[PDB]
């Protein structure tokens, strides 16, 4: 189950469960990537794996965060796999701080990410 | 040399500055935390350890950068060290992105952490 359970423990707890899937994520690198429908980024900072696909995902899926120097890598891979990257400087930042790994995106993110989607 | 030096190289070299320093951090968290003068904090999200003592360091320096539930280890470890911790977002977020760790504080942050330091 990828539901992110926003209703559910305290920010103490939905931090331990942000290190823990962290700490599973991956992996590695071109897998995650490869498993993308689009990245999310703020260019040598962050970039976020999205994955999105109707009758399979009943939401958007983070499959991914990188960081610093990591994030010119991910570019490189998503040209090799065909995956579209786009610059979200607000989306990428919250989107690294809030949601979970291998989860359906929080809330608050759902605007945001459908925009993204839409574009894609 | 704990130089940040800013007006060197691309946004791209100092993700991989940023990165590298972070790979060789340690540390363990409990020397970090007792070099440390201070930590900057988002709680739940960042700790950020700075030193600054008159005489040995020309200016702050960050000693350590941790996320997510190692925040609260952070916490109880400085509790047990006597270490401050203060809760700063904008100053705690913006030392995440782009500070180096091991190095004196960039240069935008010098009036936030000076507030703090005052403080301290
Ligand atoms: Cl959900
Ligand atoms: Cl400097």
Do not use: C
Request: net charge positive.
């Amino acid at each position: 189950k990828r539901e992110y359970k926003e209703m559910e423990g305290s920010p103490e707890i939905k931090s331990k469960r942000r290190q823990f899937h962290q700490e599973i994520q991956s992996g590695n690198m071109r897998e995650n990537v490869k498993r993308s429908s689009v990245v999310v980024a703020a260019p040598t900072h962050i970039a976020i794996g999205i994955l999105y696909k109707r009758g399979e995902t009943p939401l958007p899926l983070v499959t991914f965060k990188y960081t610093d120097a990591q994030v010119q890598t991910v570019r490189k891979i998503a040209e090799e796999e065909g995956v579209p990257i786009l610059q979200r400087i607000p989306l990428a930042r919250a989107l690294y701080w809030d949601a979970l790994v291998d989860h359906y995106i929080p809330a608050e993110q759902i605007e945001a990410t459908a925009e993204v989607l839409r574009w894609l």
